[PDB]
Structures are given as C-alpha cells and as structure tokens.
Design a protein around this ligand. Sequence first.
Ligand code: SF4
Ligand code: SF4
Ligand code: FES
Ligand code: FES
Ligand SMILES: [Fe+2]
Ligand SMILES: [Fe+2]
Lengths: 633, 633
Amino acid sequence: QNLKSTDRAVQQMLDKAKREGIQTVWDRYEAMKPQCGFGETGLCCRHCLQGPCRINPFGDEPKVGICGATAEVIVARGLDRSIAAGAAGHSGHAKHLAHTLKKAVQGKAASYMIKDRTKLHSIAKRLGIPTEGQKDEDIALEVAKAALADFHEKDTPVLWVTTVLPPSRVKVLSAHGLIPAGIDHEIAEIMHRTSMGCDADAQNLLLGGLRCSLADLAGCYMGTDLADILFGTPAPVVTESNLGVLKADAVNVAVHGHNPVLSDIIVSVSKEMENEARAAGATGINVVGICCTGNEVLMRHGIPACTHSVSQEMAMITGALDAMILDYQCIQPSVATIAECTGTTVITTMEMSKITGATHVNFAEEAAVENAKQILRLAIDTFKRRKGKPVEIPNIKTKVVAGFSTEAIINALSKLNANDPLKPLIDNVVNGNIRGVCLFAGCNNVKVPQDQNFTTIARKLLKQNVLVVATGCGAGALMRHGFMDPANVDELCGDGLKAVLTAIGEANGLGGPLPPVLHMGSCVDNSRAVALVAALANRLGVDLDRLPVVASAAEAMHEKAVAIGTWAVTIGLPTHIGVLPPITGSLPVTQILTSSVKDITGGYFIVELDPETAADKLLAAINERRAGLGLPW
Amino acid sequence: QNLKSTDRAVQQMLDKAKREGIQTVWDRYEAMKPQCGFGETGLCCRHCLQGPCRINPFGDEPKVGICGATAEVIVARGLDRSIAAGAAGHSGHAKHLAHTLKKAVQGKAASYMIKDRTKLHSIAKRLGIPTEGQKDEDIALEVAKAALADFHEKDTPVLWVTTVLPPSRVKVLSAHGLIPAGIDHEIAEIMHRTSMGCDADAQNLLLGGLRCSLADLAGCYMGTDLADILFGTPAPVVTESNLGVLKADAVNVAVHGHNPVLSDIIVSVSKEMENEARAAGATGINVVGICCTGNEVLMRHGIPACTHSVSQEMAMITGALDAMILDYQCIQPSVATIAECTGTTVITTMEMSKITGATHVNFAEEAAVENAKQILRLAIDTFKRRKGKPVEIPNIKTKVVAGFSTEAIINALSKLNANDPLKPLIDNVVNGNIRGVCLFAGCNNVKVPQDQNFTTIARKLLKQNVLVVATGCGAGALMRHGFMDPANVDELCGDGLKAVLTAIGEANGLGGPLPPVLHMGSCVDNSRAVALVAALANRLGVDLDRLPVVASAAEAMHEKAVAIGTWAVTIGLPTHIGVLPPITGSLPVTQILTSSVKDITGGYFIVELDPETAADKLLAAINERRAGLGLPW
Ligand code: SF4
Ligand code: SF4
Ligand code: FES
Ligand code: FES
Ligand SMILES: [Fe+2]
Ligand SMILES: [Fe+2]
C-alpha cells in the first residue's frame, strides 16, 4: 500500500477496503491503465462534432486537426479551458460568499454576520470604499457589491486583481493586456476563443489563459477576503490531523468540499447539539474536515483534519464516519456508492452539486441553522444505526499548528519588530538564515504516491533554510506527515531556518519555534500567500519576479490547481508542477510556459515529476532570485 | 468528389485542390480515421490531471472514471461544457454588438448609428424601457445597458429570455429552475459544476445544460436585436450564391466569421473604394460572404454568398479570392496555410481570434472606416499580384431570394390579412395547405456528404407541405442547391404549400411565389424563428410545445449548434440532429435528451443520421403536434 499512499493511516484503510472488496480511487486508476497517450500529451480535441481529433505526438498522420487546428492550438485551447474551469470554481465560491455577506447585512440571513470588522474596513479601504462616517453594514454592502461587480465588465478592471498586486506588477500585466475585465467575462471569453474556428495562435491563446488565471486569482482573493469578514481572519491554532481524529464513540461528521458558508455553521450548530447527540448514546458531535472546507474550519476553529484529496474515501472505510456533508469541488463521486457499504450518510447541499444516491438537503443561508440541524440529525441517526458495529479507526494522528493568515504572520513577525514587521523576515533572507520562500499548493493525484512529492520536496527545501508555507491539500499532506508540529523543527529544519522559527516563536511566548511549515489555509487562501509576497515586494520596492519566492503544485489534480499554477506564473513566480499537465504534445506551448513566459511575466513553469530533481530546480530558481538581488546563496 | 460534397462547385474545387496537392478538410478527415470511439460516444473525460479517463461503451474495465464519475456523469458533463462553449460564442457576439451600440450613441464610433429606429423602440418596449419623451440615443443607451446587464446576476433574470418567450413557457421553465440568472453567470456555473468533484447527477447536470442553452438563446436574440438596430432589419432581397459569384476581374473579398460590426462596414466602405480598385485594374471590389457574417450582409444588403462551413477553403482554391476578412467562429484555421498556396490575404481583426500566419489588422469600431480601408487596400494589392494568373471559378451559382426576418414574414402575410397577419398562416396550417414548420439550422459536418442531409430532408418535407425556414449554413446549403429560388417552387413544393407561397407572393406583387425555403438569416437569427414561433404561440393561446413546429440541425458541427439544438428542445420543439453528439455512451443521458425531457419542456432531441428516416421522424413529430391540436394530418 506504500506504493499508493505514504500515509500509514491511508495504508491501513487500503488494506481494510481490499479485504472488504470496496473499490477505491487507486483501484479505479489501475483499471484505467494504460491511459490514453493523446489525452496525456494534450493532443486530443473534442471542441466540435467533427471530432474527436487527435494528433500523433510522433510519426505519421494524423498530424493536424480536421479543421486545421495544429498541435500548438489544440494544446493551448485545452489548457485555456482548464484554466477557465478552475477560475469558474473559485469564482463560484467567491460569488457564494459575496451573496452571503449581502444577505447577512440586509437582515436576510441572521446566522451570518460581520465577524471581522477590521478586515471589512481594510478591504473597503483597499477597494476605495469610504468607511469614514459609514455604518458597518453599509460598508459591507458596498464591499459585497464591489465583489459582485468584478464578475462582469464595468468602468474599472477586476479590482480583486488591480488592488492586490503592486502597481509595478499591474503595469507589467496591463502592458501585455493581461488584466481581467471581469471574472465571468474572462471565463466566457476563454470558452469562446477556444471554440472551433476562433483563436488559433498559441501565444495569443496562452495570453488569454494568463489573463483568465488572474480572474481565478481574483476569485481566490475575493473568497479569502469575504470568508474572513464573515467567519474571522485565522490566527494561530493548535489541532490534529489524520484518520485518528475520528472517535468511535462520537457522531463523526466530515465537512467536505470548499465553502465555509456551510461548514462554519455546521461547526457552530454541532456544539449546540451536543446534548441531543449524547441523548443518542454518543459523546457528542465530532466535526472533522476533509479537503478545503476542512482547512477553512481548521484555520478558524481548530477543527481537526480527517484527510484530504485522493484518500478521502478512506475516512468512510473506517466505519465510523456517520456523515459526510458536501458542498462542491474535489469530492470523488465514488463516495455516494461507498456510503452504501460503509453506512455513511453522504449529504449534498448545493443545487449545482448533487451526486446520484446521496441525500440532498438544500442549504439556504436564510435557514442555515435549521438546515444544519436537519443535516446533523441525519448524522445522529446514522451513529445510532452503527451501535455495536466494530470500527477500524487507525490510531494515527499528528499535532498541527496552523492558522497562519498573512495578518497572523505579520503579527508574529511584529513581535521582533513592531513598526516594521516584514523587516525581520527580510533581514534573515538577506543574511541567509532564510534562503527563500516556497508555497506548496494544490492537490494529491492518484498518479503520485500520496504525499511523496510534497514531503520529499519539503524536506530538501527545509534543510536548505527555505521558509515553507502551504495551502490546500499541500498543507494537508504536510500536516499529516508532521510538518506542522513544532516538535519536528530540529529534525526537519536547517540551522538558519530553525534559528528564525525559534526567534519568532519565542517572541510570541511559545517557549518554542513556529512549526516547520506555515499553514496559510485553503486553496482560495493561496491569495494569502499573494498578500504576503506582494507586501514583501512593496516593502522592498521591487516586483514579485525579483523575490526569492517559488511555488510548487507538487501533486496537482484539479483544474483549479492548473489555474492557480498559471496565476503564480503570471504574478512572477517560478512555479513547479509535479504532474504532467497535457502540454508535452506541443514543444512550442511547453517552451512558452516554461521559458518564454519569463519575458512576459517573469514567472515560469517548472515541470518536473521527480521530486528530488524538482527540489533542486526550485532551489536553483530561489538562488537565481537571490543572485539577482545581489545576495549570497 | 460527390462522396465529399453534393455541391458541384465544391466538387470542381476539390479536383483542383487534389491536382495542386492542397490538403483540404476532407483530406484531414480521412487522415483522422478511424476516430477515437471513446470520444465519439462521449466516454472520455479530461476534467482533471488524473485523467485522461475513458469508459468502454461495452465489455470490461474501465467502467468508471478514476474519481468515480459514471458514464452518465462524464457524458452529461462533456455535453454541458459544449453548451457553455456555444453560449459563450453567441454571447461574445451579442456583447460585441452591445458595446458597439453604446459607443455609437455616445459619439465614440461615428461609423455606426441607429439605422432601425422602429426596431430600437419595439425592443425598448419589450424590455420595459420607456421611450415616451426620450431621445433615441438615450433609449439605445438603455437598451445597450440592459443587454450588458443580462450577462450577470441582477434583480431580474435574463430579460432576453423572459421577455421573448410567452409567459406560459417562462412559467414552465421557471418551475424547473431553467431560467438563466445571467448569460456569463450560467457559462461559469456550467464550467464549475462540470469540474472535478462537483455535479455528479445526470438529471441535475442536464437541467444545468438546458438553462445554459437558454443563456445561448438570449445571446442569439440579443445579437439579432442589436444587429438589426445598428444595420437594419432585413427585408426580402434577391442575390446569388455559390463560387460563381466570384469575379476574376474584380477584387474578391470574402467576409467570413460572424459579427456584422465588421462585415457591414466592409460592405459600405468597399463601395466607396470602387475607383481606387479600378485604379488597380479591377472592375471594383466584389464583397462576397462566407458563413454567418456572409449571411448577415446577404440578409441586409444582398451581398452574394460565396460558400459556407465545411467547403470554405474551396473559395480560396479558385485562385481569385484576394482577401478573406475574419472576425471569429467557424473559420477553419487551415485557411492561413492554404493562403500561402493560393495567394489569398487572410486577415484577422479581433484580439481574441488570431491565426498563426494570417495578417492581423486590429479593427476598432472607433476607427471602423479607417481600418476597413487598410484591410481593403491589402486586398487590392493582392488582386494586383495575381495579374495574369489563371483562375478557376466554377461558373456555378443559384438565385437566392432571402431577407425573411420575422418582421418581413409578418409584413408579407399582412398583405393577405392586414390586421391579423398570422391568421393566414394559421388558416393554412388548419386546412392542411401547410402541414407544419421546420427550421433547418446549423452547420455542415465533414462526416456528412456536404448538404446531403439538408437537401434530402428539405425535399421530403416540402413535398409534404411543410413550411421550411432556414438559418446559418442550413440556409447556406439550401440556397446553394436552389431552394431559395422561387423558380423551383413547382418542382420542390407540395400543392398545398405551393398554393400558400403563391398566394403570399402574389399579394406582395411578385407575379410569383415566395421561395421554397425562407431564409431567416444567421445563426443568431435562429432567434428570429423563435420570435415567429412565439408570436404564433401567443396568437393561438398555446405554448410552443403544442405547435406543429420542429427543428433540424441536420449536419451539426459547432458547439454553438449543440447550444441551439438544446435551447430548441428547451423552448418545446422536437429537434432533429443529423450527426451523433457524444452521448451514445450513456443510455440514461440519451434517454433524457430524446424522451424524458418531453416531460420537462415538451421538446426533445431526435438523433437520426439517416436523412430519409430523419424526415419521416420530423413529419411524425409535426403530425403528432397536429393531432394534439385536433387537426387532420
Ligand atoms: S475544433 Fe477542429 S481539431 Fe477540434 S474536434 Fe473540431 S475539427 Fe477537430
Ligand atoms: S474528473 Fe474524474 S473522470 Fe474526469 S479526468 Fe478527472 S478522475 Fe478522470
Ligand atoms: S483520443 Fe484519448 S483523450 Fe481523446
Ligand atoms: S480516449 Fe479518445 S477522446 Fe479521450
Ligand atoms: Fe480545494
Ligand atoms: Fe455561424
């Protein structure tokens, strides 16, 4: 099972699933081999009913699409549609939060409120919205309106791009026509330009892609902004991760998907229903997180993370998962069928994300508490149905210190320098105690032994004094392997990095260092990393493409991860991807994405499937940036 | 060559292309065989980097996607993305027209103006925009704003759906949650819900699809409305079609793509540059149309149609095509390479639709005349470069009577009944002189011998007294085979239909009938057919799903054609498609689309590749509707 996952809890559940004849994602992957090489290389097109078209990567015919689309057009069009799809996910998420905020402050959803007034005001200020003499509810109404306005064309570009990157960066992007006009506008334009008989120039197509990726960034940043207003900006919190956070004697409820609009209420209402759960013979309701929505409630409330991404089915295989509460994105639809075998009640809540065989309980913000109770009562009934049934929860969990929003990081650093909080970080970059910064982001992928790339790359970078920050299932991987436990600093960290983590932790009263890796939250919270890096850029008076900062989507899967990688490149970062995106069928496209794009944005993709080699390449990219700033490396 | 195209001009150019070693769309199709059966059946998914996933239509593994996506989810997701892509094309088109109108009435684009004031006012009235005491420019500004507002969420649904279908129909659609909230909103939501780990219920997915198809309808209707305001509502016009409209001694300029914003100016400016063309040794500038933008200028100005869709390369093969002026959609990118062999100057004009190797001349509405002259001067230079070169223009063309907007049709009918213009049509439906109405729409497809389905089906229906109307490349096919020449009425039409066409033509002073088939314009002008059918519905006090009206996308290709078929079903029409959409890999999806959707919208797909059988099925659908209305059949 170590060939499937490096997570021992997952390995244990894989053995149980095998024993019980429950098919997993790894089994479905094995059944899919060998996968289509046309798809793998990007040399397939189904954009019209004359298709499917394919192009042999090498050899003889077919060499070109039926309409005349070249390999470079077909590859660039496919990529662009993946970026649009990612943008559409993050922007649906952000939009849901925008309408929730609007409803809350209009008196239409009393379960929701302005929890972070400081965040609300700072956002308003960043957007140009007056706060002076204004009611919080009116400021928030204006913020929600601005959010919604960024989805379409108007007299300004997307503010959740132009107001979050340094002017120098906006200027570079504007010069290349890369600033999004509207989030959904860009999504639609991509779908248009990539449809048959439209855009058929690789560079032009890819430039569209870059612009659409910035629409994704806007959605991410908007989602983080709005979730923070509604649910609070994360601060450092201690919790646990992995399957051992499940409790046989509790009603175990997984929140799974992405939107804190749902999970945050589940968390609060679950505490209110403890006695009712105890009436049913449980100790209480044990809310645990899967995927980003788990990350959301982990960051804000210290809700323990059960598992992530590719291993999500394994939580069910324990036999102790009474409910899995879903909104949207990254939910393997296998869960609905597996539920039948495991007893788990899988519940969908969003009109646009149903799964055949799951129970659907409409969630309306207007009735959030009511709907939460209905959902949690299904979970209690399910707990009761497994009275006397043996469960196998691997007794495996790690300690996780998380909640490192950018505000939290700045606050942490401020204990070393109150009025110039970024300076201590920069001082240590300059003196070599911090070599650079690496953001690990994105998914696991069934193609890569689970977590192997994240942990292999993270280990190499940490020994080389790289400050490692993480989001999404990258944070998931690292937390589950102990990288968020400060007790592991001595083992994992180079002396310089240890020195810095220790200095900061001790100034924050911890008697010990910050953790080896800083958990910056969910996938939309990649925007937090952007805020940090942009703040550093602003503090240094240079653009992001001069900073020793890189990203690694080490085990990428979702279209959202492709969108995030692409905007990481677009804002000026060397961006590693540890799985093959469908681009190798076109050398010119590959060359643009991995080389010539440097001349446009300063960022670039580093496609590297071998994690040791990926780590060297990321270190090289970091060190090149250091040299560019005149620093030793 | 008759196995490739039933068009003799195209056959002649195919022989020339063969002789000269110029690869065509048919050659590229041959090189693609056998095509991937996974793609053909819809049983392939590339929505994440764990893919590509495929499912064997029959047999053993793989049976399910790696994430657990079933055949029915994979098929429905692929379909939904095609609908979104179509919607995105039509909505990009409509949006371009909306900004052009805005610019025109704000004094920013003097080449453009309100040409149809009556249309402007009636649209304003349909939308609820006051005109009484208002300046035309302000009414138009409000119309343009309403247009743009329909792209995003607001306090009303998409008005270019809710104000164009009868209230009963809107009520049925609203009951099923099918009314679009915003055009680009729906496009984005589709891309979201079809991304990995989101929507995974076929019915739910398909309902999303239906709603997105109505966003496409809105874009179509908006495009027609706005083009009519700007460029004039078509009325009956006589012109010609096929390759023989090219003239060896003229500067031959094809307008190709979709948007009249471009082609309409090319047409007007070309007349202004006659003497300059004559200075270059040409008789003048011979503007000819390809695809929809050709249809646009044909409908309004009687510009002759050169060719359509699948045979577009053949115009170049003549050696006489001096320029091909492109905006977007349905342009085979092969044209850029073929241009090198044929001498044709291929010119792109839209930022989001470039083709490697073509000359790009940015077109800005603000500089439309200037940009047109620059473009046309490239064409004149190209004419000069072929001085003394032999050309082979097939001396093959048909007479085309076209320009049958719904307003034109109503006006035609009004000559028989001034104050109840629809009644004569209905009278003849009731007495059997008109059996029903069939709309032919959409593309040619290299899989179907060009035009064979359109003409085979049209012939059968016309003999059975069906009133045949046509748009896009369906109109193209029929015009090129003589179906728009009133001289062919005796041959083609049943006695009843002939009686009616003759009665209407004679009342309009023609001394002869209307043509066998009524050309209702471009693909967005499928919305004209909706206006006609909705007007009939309103006049009869019944919904569209009770009317003896069907559609046939007999040789469909583009995602736009899939979107149009899908909204034809959604508004309540039996809708034939004569190519296999990628749905046969899922019986449940196929069953929804061809049967159970009847219970939702009253419309349904009729998938039939055999055109004789398709015609019988369409006649059966028409006759069922007649029986439902208590009429003989
Ligand atoms: S758009 Fe071109 S390459 Fe793609 S399926 Fe259609 S004919 Fe083939
Ligand atoms: S979304 Fe599911 S079926 Fe599609 S490629 Fe990814 S794992 Fe395969
Ligand atoms: S030929 Fe396999 S992905 Fe299309
Ligand atoms: S396996 Fe051929 S279309 Fe994907
Ligand atoms: Fe996520
Ligand atoms: Fe068209």
